[PDB]
């Protein structure tokens, strides 16, 4: 009757069953197992109910609905207990990383989008001072992610864009998110996101020195964000300035930090509104066909043509004639999988070096379920990827082989 009773919400039979199964040694583990199966069934049903809709808020709310129902059930009729809670966590961990017949797992994308929708100043599906509770609840699903690596990278890109373009609602709220992600997934693992966040704040404070620098002398002020390149995913998109004395900023930063290299991301800079949305905030060419504005000074023409197209088709320029206006990411994530591949190869190189220092000779049959134990904190790799590591490290002078009648991988140092 355990199977029949744990799948029933009502009445005394559950209650006294839990008492008598606390008594028997074989009782509580069977209850735990049946409840784990029940939780996996319910969670899979709840997640799979959203076919072709795939709304991130409703996805997270489905997982949290199952979690809330089972927590309430456990406290109401079983007991608040580590074993039932662990069964819930394990089952939902198994659930969240999807296995649909015609689509690879989309959960880390939806979870990154949930965080961005929380933090956006638009705040369409979520609202400030409720976002705190929402992102507290998000930790429940955050612990359940298998490829925390993929979720972290996907959130990192949209974090970068939101903070650079000022789309985030509150800088403090972004820090609160990053702290919650750090305690959920690891401070060391989320450190790069923390550095990316820190760049805007520290550079904003450093602009208090840059303004004094600009006023110190003439003939060589504006805000700067200087970005720590090893963490940031954004690039220059290989662009005229609104204020246009950027070499003063370069001189200031170099003199302040004698030991740092730097380059300018003109594609991402922004200005200020209005002439006398009121949008003039990007790519102040100052001048006619849009293509003729490629007559700039010496500059990367790739970026130039991109900015020309952007300027032509937003708001401001109202081929035979032109005039000015009278008044006023799934493909990218799929692309980011490439950077994920590079990062995973680096990570597996480190992990394989640790494994090789632990045991100096091995074979791939033993390497299976050891690399998973050494990588599951971030991701759950494939055997082809593990072999992609090993069969290059043999020629990197990391691994060596001499055996003929059997497998081998011998550490090199």
């Amino acid at each position: 009757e355990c199977h029949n009773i744990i799948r029933q919400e009502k009445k005394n039979d559950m209650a006294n069953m839990y008492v008598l199964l606390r008594a028997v040694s074989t009782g509580l583990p069977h209850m735990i197992q049946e409840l784990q199966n029940h939780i996996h069934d319910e969670g899979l049903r709840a997640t799979s109910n959203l076919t072709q809709e795939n709304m991130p808020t409703l996805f997270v709310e489905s997982v949290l609905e199952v979690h809330g129902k089972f927590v309430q059930l456990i406290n109401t009729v079983l007991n608040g207990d580590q074993h039932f809670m662990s069964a819930l966590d394990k089952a939902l961990t198994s659930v969240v990383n999807y296995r649909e017949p015609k689509s690879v797992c989309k959960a880390p994308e939806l979870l990154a989008k949930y965080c961005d929708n929380l933090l956006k100043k638009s705040a369409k599906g979520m609202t400030e001072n409720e976002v705190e509770d929402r992102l507290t609840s998000f930790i429940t699903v955050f612990k359940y992610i298998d490829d925390k690596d993929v979720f972290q990278k996907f959130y990192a890109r949209m974090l970068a864009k939101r903070l650079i373009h000022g789309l985030s609602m509150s800088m403090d709220s972004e820090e609160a998110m990053i702290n919650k992600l750090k305690q959920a997934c690891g401070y060391e693992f989320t450190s790069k996101l923390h550095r990316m966040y820190t760049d805007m704040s520290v550079s904003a404070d450093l602009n208090n020195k840059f303004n004094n620098f600009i006023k110190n002398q003439d003939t060589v002020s504006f805000q700067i964000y200087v970005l720590q390149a090893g963490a940031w995913p954004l690039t220059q998109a290989p662009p005229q300035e609104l204020e246009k004395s950027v070499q003063m900023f370069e001189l200031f930063y170099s003199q302040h930090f004698s030991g740092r290299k730097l380059t300018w991301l003109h594609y991402l800079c922004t200005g200020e509104v209005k002439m006398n949305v009121a949008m003039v905030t990007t790519y102040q060419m100052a001048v006619v066909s849009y293509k003729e504005l490629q007559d700039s000074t010496q500059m990367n023409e790739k970026e130039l043509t991109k900015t020309i197209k952007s300027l032509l088709d937003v708001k401001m320029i109202n081929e035979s004639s032109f005039s000015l206006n009278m008044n006023f990411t799934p493909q990218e994530m799929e692309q980011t999988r490439s950077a994920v591949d590079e990062d995973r190869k680096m990570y597996l190189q480190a992990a394989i070096v640790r494994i090789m220092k632990a045991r100096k000779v091995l074979r791939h049959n033993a390497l299976i379920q050891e690399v998973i134990s050494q990588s599951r904190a971030r991701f759950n790799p494939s055997i082809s990827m593990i072999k992609k590591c090993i069969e290059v490290l043999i020629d990197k002078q990391y691994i060596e082989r001499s055996q003929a009648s059997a497998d081998e991988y011998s550490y090199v140092a």
Binding site: Q223, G230, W232, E241, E272, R354
Partner: protein
Amino acid sequence: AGKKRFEVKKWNAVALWAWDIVVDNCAICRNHIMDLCIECQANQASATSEECTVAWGVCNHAFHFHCISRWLKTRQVCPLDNREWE
């Protein structure tokens, strides 16, 4: 006054910064100079990942100190240029 001014105004510049390499996964170690090398990453060392032990040559390009030391103990050439090491 006209609508075509594009006046000089308040502006928000953006830039990257790094330690002094054209990095492209610098050949002594398949890592960024702003991140731990393979040995320190495998060990998960307590050193600052952003600045593990950065050092500069006489040519003023940067290297990981551990990696250049290990390279120096076997070959007499600069790792990034293959000229005489200095």
